[PDB]
Amino acid sequence: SGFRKMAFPSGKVEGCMVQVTCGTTTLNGLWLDDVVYCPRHVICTSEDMLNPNYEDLLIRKSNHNFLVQAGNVQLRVIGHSMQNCVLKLKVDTANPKTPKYKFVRIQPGQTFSVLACYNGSPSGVYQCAMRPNFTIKGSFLNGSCGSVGFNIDYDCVSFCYMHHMELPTGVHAGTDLEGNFYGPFVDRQTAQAAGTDTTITVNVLAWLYAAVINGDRWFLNRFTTTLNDFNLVAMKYNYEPLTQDHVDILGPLSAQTGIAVLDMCASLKELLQNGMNGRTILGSALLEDEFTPFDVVRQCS
Amino acid sequence: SGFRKMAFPSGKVEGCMVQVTCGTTTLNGLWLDDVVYCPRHVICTSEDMLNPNYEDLLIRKSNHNFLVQAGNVQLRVIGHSMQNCVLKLKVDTANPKTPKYKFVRIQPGQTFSVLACYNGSPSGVYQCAMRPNFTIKGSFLNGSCGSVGFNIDYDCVSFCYMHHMELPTGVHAGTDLEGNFYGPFVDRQTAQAAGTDTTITVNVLAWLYAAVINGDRWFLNRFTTTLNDFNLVAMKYNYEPLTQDHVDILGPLSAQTGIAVLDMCASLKELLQNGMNGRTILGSALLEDEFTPFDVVRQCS
Numbered sequence: 001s002g003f004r005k006m007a008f009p010s011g012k013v014e015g016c017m018v019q020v021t022c023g024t025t026t027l028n029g030l031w032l033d034d035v036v037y038c039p040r041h042v043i044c045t046s047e048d049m050l051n052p053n054y055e056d057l058l059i060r061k062s063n064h065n066f067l068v069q070a071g072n073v074q075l076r077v078i079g080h081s082m083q084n085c086v087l088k089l090k091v092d093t094a095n096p097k098t099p100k101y102k103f104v105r106i107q108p109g110q111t112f113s114v115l116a117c118y119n120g121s122p123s124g125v126y127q128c129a130m131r132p133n134f135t136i137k138g139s140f141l142n143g144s145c146g147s148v149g150f151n152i153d154y155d156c157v158s159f160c161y162m163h164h165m166e167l168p169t170g171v172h173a174g175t176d177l178e179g180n181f182y183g184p185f186v187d188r189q190t191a192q193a194a195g196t197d198t199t200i201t202v203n204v205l206a207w208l209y210a211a212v213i214n215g216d217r218w219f220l221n222r223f224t225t226t227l228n229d230f231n232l233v234a235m236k237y238n239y240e241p242l243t244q245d246h247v248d249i250l251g252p253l254s255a256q257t258g259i260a261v262l263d264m265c266a267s268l269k270e271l272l273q274n275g276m277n278g279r280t281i282l283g284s285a286l287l288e289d290e291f292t293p294f295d296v297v298r299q300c301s
Numbered sequence: 302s303g304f305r306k307m308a309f310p311s312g313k314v315e316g317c318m319v320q321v322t323c324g325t326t327t328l329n330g331l332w333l334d335d336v337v338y339c340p341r342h343v344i345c346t347s348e349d350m351l352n353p354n355y356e357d358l359l360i361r362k363s364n365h366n367f368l369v370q371a372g373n374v375q376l377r378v379i380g381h382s383m384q385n386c387v388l389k390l391k392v393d394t395a396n397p398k399t400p401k402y403k404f405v406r407i408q409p410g411q412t413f414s415v416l417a418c419y420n421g422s423p424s425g426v427y428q429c430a431m432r433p434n435f436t437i438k439g440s441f442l443n444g445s446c447g448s449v450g451f452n453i454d455y456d457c458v459s460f461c462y463m464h465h466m467e468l469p470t471g472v473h474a475g476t477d478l479e480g481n482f483y484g485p486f487v488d489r490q491t492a493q494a495a496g497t498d499t500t501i502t503v504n505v506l507a508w509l510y511a512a513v514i515n516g517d518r519w520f521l522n523r524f525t526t527t528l529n530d531f532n533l534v535a536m537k538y539n540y541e542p543l544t545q546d547h548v549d550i551l552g553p554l555s556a557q558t559g560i561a562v563l564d565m566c567a568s569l570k571e572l573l574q575n576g577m578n579g580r581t582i583l584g585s586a587l588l589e590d591e592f593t594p595f596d597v598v599r600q601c602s
Contacts, residue, residue, distance in 0.1 A: 001440075001441070001442075001467060002438060002439050002440035002471065002473065003440055003469045004306075004416070004429075004438075004439065004440045005305075005306060005427060006424075006425030006426065006427045006440065007308060007425060007426050007427065008425060008426070009311045009312070009315050009416065009424070009425065010311050010312055010426065011310070011311055011312025011313070011316065012312070013422075014310050014312040014409070015312065019550040025560035029468075071437055089344070114312065116307070118533040122310035122312075123307075123310070124307030124308060124309060124310065124600070125307065125308050125309070125311065125426055125597075126305040126306060126308065126312055127306045128305075132343075137303060137584070138303050138305065138467045139302075139303035139304055139305045139307065139600055140302070140303060141302075141601075142601070166302060170302045170303065170515065170516060171303075172303065199370070215471060216470065270461060275579075278576075280587065283438070283587075284585070284586070285586035285587045286581065286584075286585070286586045298424075298443075299440055300423070
């Protein structure tokens, strides 16, 4: 039993983390085949980072200007390129430990593991969700840039997140591995606002279904409700509105537990209006929204 | 910024997880050098597990009776032995991916990462603490036995936990890697009681210090208190009593934040008596006790 935030086993991604330096900026890179992926502000000095013309900064630099450390420095930059806020450093040696991998732009609600990396070395691993303001609540210090987020499902590492920047909120913003930022964000030291952090209703529900499976059932109510009626209540508390696709993918969980989705939506409704009354569901006193339906199915079976 | 439950990078321990089978029992083993470590109930049939004479069951079995799968089956059991609830299967090949490692009996309060493993394959990684009833609140299914817990500090994997059994409570019990169970427990299907789960006061405090560093400061009070006076309040709420050694090891955190330990002990006291008032410290509505002082220092710097 039990239900904790799990991350994927990180070994496959560890053997891909390198140290990259351009001038005196050191950040982490992702080495896969003969290409070493990193955030593009590696080329920037401290004074440039207010509003920098990166392409103009990249002309200043050449192939030898970038130094990928790895364990010991034997990476020869054979080429360079700037794709949409990332640098791709073609190198001589192809990574012996390249796992089967793929680049994936995830969606809000979907979850991934983060391997936090300082100076090319992995420090820790935790599970994160991509929020609807397209930020993540992670744990990143200075030089966590270049750290990556992944799903290792079905033997294959799906890279979805590279970390770039913390925001004044204290939340973390970044990019897929083709460079483009999740959300409206940009890689400058300018004030940048995340929006409202709508809670991921379909995950709260899955985390509840997970709770019934682990033995917590006090939140189970004798009522039921409607999508439209639950959604009116979801709105006031700034929950994401529930779709039939959400009801679909909660299918197997409703099956396992013997509890219709809308019935769980009625427990959730009461749980939003009258609050949790000091009780704990699965060891939390708040409603947890960072386990997908898929996450719950996998950990409970 | 941010503060999430991190686990260590698991790669070093992944390359040590194997599949072990004796008769029709399949559980996970830990392969290190030419020895494959597993729980001793691998030898038991289903009917034996009520009260089994293991040593008598081990006479029935010989070197060929144990089949360590690994990726593909090429492990030749050259010897066998039963140390204090574990089997040690001397094999022909020494693990190419043996990390620097060590076996360590941890202490209550101390924390470790768990790599959950079903059929010799790692499934996920999460951080756990050894509770004072000597149980852990983990996430383990059927065939999680043989999964291990570790600290990877200073390049070296410190193995501390092998998983054996879930209890009727829903909590998890196991052993160090020399076999002996944490706590009073035994590897039989008999009813076995964990005691009171005293909360780890020195960790709640570190998790609070972590909160001041990340920007949450509402719980900061204008009062102070005494050890003896805080401890009287710790007792009613079944917190572990605070020592000067606890105050010592919180030193650097009191330094970083500019907040004396006892002052934090007075915030904690009010926080136990008047509760959290619906507010959240670091994203939790309860007091978190599974980050050590050491854990906090490492993640905040």
